[PDB]
Design an enzyme around this catalytic site. Structure first.
Site, PDB file in Angstrom:
ATOM      1  N   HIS A 144      25.279 161.114  48.921  1.00 48.98           N
ATOM      2  CA  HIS A 144      25.223 160.378  47.652  1.00 48.98           C
ATOM      3  C   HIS A 144      26.416 160.698  46.741  1.00 48.98           C
ATOM      4  CE1 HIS A 144      22.972 163.853  45.786  1.00 48.98           C
ATOM      5  NE2 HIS A 144      23.622 163.429  44.712  1.00 48.98           N
ATOM      6  N   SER A 160      24.835 168.152  42.425  1.00 46.41           N
ATOM      7  CA  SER A 160      24.712 167.368  43.664  1.00 46.41           C
ATOM      8  C   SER A 160      25.765 167.744  44.678  1.00 46.41           C
ATOM      9  CB  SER A 160      24.898 165.882  43.356  1.00 46.41           C
ATOM     10  OG  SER A 160      23.776 165.393  42.675  1.00 46.41           O
ATOM     11  N   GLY A 161      25.345 167.908  45.928  1.00 45.53           N
ATOM     12  CA  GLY A 161      26.290 168.148  47.017  1.00 45.53           C
ATOM     13  C   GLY A 161      26.612 169.615  47.244  1.00 45.53           C
ATOM     14  N   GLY A 187      24.991 166.787  38.540  1.00 43.51           N
ATOM     15  CA  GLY A 187      26.286 167.471  38.574  1.00 43.51           C
ATOM     16  C   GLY A 187      26.328 168.620  39.568  1.00 43.51           C
ATOM     17  N   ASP A 224      20.876 162.954  53.626  1.00 39.23           N
ATOM     18  CA  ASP A 224      21.835 163.031  52.517  1.00 39.23           C
ATOM     19  C   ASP A 224      22.897 164.111  52.782  1.00 39.23           C
ATOM     20  OD1 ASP A 224      23.098 162.597  50.127  1.00 39.23           O
ATOM     21  OD2 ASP A 224      21.544 163.514  48.869  1.00 39.23           O
TER      22      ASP A 224
END
Ligand code: H06
Ligand code: CA
Length: 223
Positions: free
Chosen positions: A40, A177-178, A175, A84
Site C-alpha cells: 500500500h 506504514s511499511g 506514517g 500487503d
C-alpha cells in the site's frame, strides 16, 4: 507510533524512510540492494533514505539511494490489504556498517506472546495529529490469531497477524506504514493497517512476513 519511546539515533539500523519529496512510509533493509515495505506504500519516484534519525536534518549517517524498481506482491489486494508486501531494489548497493544494516528474514513464523520491536516516523497521537522528526519505537507482543480475528471480524487472513495491546494506548499509526516488526532479531511483520491508532480492542495488523520468504528469495534471485 503512539505510546512509544524515542529509539535513539541509528539504534534501528535496518529502518528506512521512503521519500518522494517527504517521508511517506517506512521499510526494512534486507540486504545491500533490497528493501521490504507494504504494497500500500507503492508509488513511483521513491528515494530510499537509510541511516536516518531526524528525517528533517542531515545528521551525518544518511545514505540516499533512488529505487530502480518496485515489485508489488503478485496477489496484493488493495481493498482487503491481503498480501500487503512489496520489494524495492536500490539503484546502487548500500554501504553496510553498524548504523546501516540489513535485518534477517525469518526461517519460521513467530508465535503469539513473542515480543517485537515496531518502529517508524508515523503519527504519535491517537486522537489528534503530531508527526515526530526522530525515529520512534514500541515494544509489543504478538497477539493470538483468535483475539486478532475477534477484534476484526471477517478481515484477518492467514497473511496477517495482530500485535500490540487490546487495552489501547500503544500502537503503530499513519506514517508508520511499511515499517518493521522485528522479533528475536527477525523481520516478522510489516506495518499494514488498523482501525484508528491505539484504540481499545483495535490492535495493529501486520503483514505476516514468514509467509513470503520464499517469494522474496526467488524474486531477489532473478531481479
Ligand atoms: N493501528 C495501526 N496499527 C495502524 C492504523 C493505520 C495505519 C495506516 N494509516 N493510514 C492512513 O490513515 C492514511 C494514509 C494515507 C492516506 N490516507 C490515510 C497504520 C497502522
Ligand atoms: Ca537525517
Amino acid at each position: 507510533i503512539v505510546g512509544g519511546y524515542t529509539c535513539g539515533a541509528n539504534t534501528v539500523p535496518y529502518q528506512v524512510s521512503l521519500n518522494s519529496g517527504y517521508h511517506f512510509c517506512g521499510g526494512s533493509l534486507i540486504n545491500s540492494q533490497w528493501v521490504v515495505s507494504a504494497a500500500h506504500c507503492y508509488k513511483s519516484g521513491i528515494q530510499v533514505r537509510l541511516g536516518e534519525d531526524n528525517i528533517n536534518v542531515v545528521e551525518g549517517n544518511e545514505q540516499f539511494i533512488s529505487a530502480s524498481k518496485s515489485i508489488v506482491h503478485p496477489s496484493y489486494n488493495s481493498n482487503t490489504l491481503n498480501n500487503d508486501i512489496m520489494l524495492i531494489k536500490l539503484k546502487s548497493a548500500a554501504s553496510l556498517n553498524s548504523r546501516v544494516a540489513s535485518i534477517s528474514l525469518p526461517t519460521s513464523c513467530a508465535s503469539a506472546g513473542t515480543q517485537c520491536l515496531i518502529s517508524g516516523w508515523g503519527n504519535t497521537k491517537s486522537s489528534g495529529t503530531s508527526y515526530p522528526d526522530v525515529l520512534k519505537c514500541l515494544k509489543a507482543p504478538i497477539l493470538s490469531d483468535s483475539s486478532c480475528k475477534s477484534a476484526y471480524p471477517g478481515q484477518i487472513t492467514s497473511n496477517m497477524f495482530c500485535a500490540g495491546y487490546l487495552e489501547g494506548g500503544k500502537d503503530s499509526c499513519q506514517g508508520d506504514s511499511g515499517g518493521p516488526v522485528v522479533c528475536s532479531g527477525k523481520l516478522q511483520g510489516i506495518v499494514s493497517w488498523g482501525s484508528g491508532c491505539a484504540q481499545k480492542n483495535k490492535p495493529g495488523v501486520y503483514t505476516k512476513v514468514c509467509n513470503y520468504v520464499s517469494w522474496i528469495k526467488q524474486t531477489i534471485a532473478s531481479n
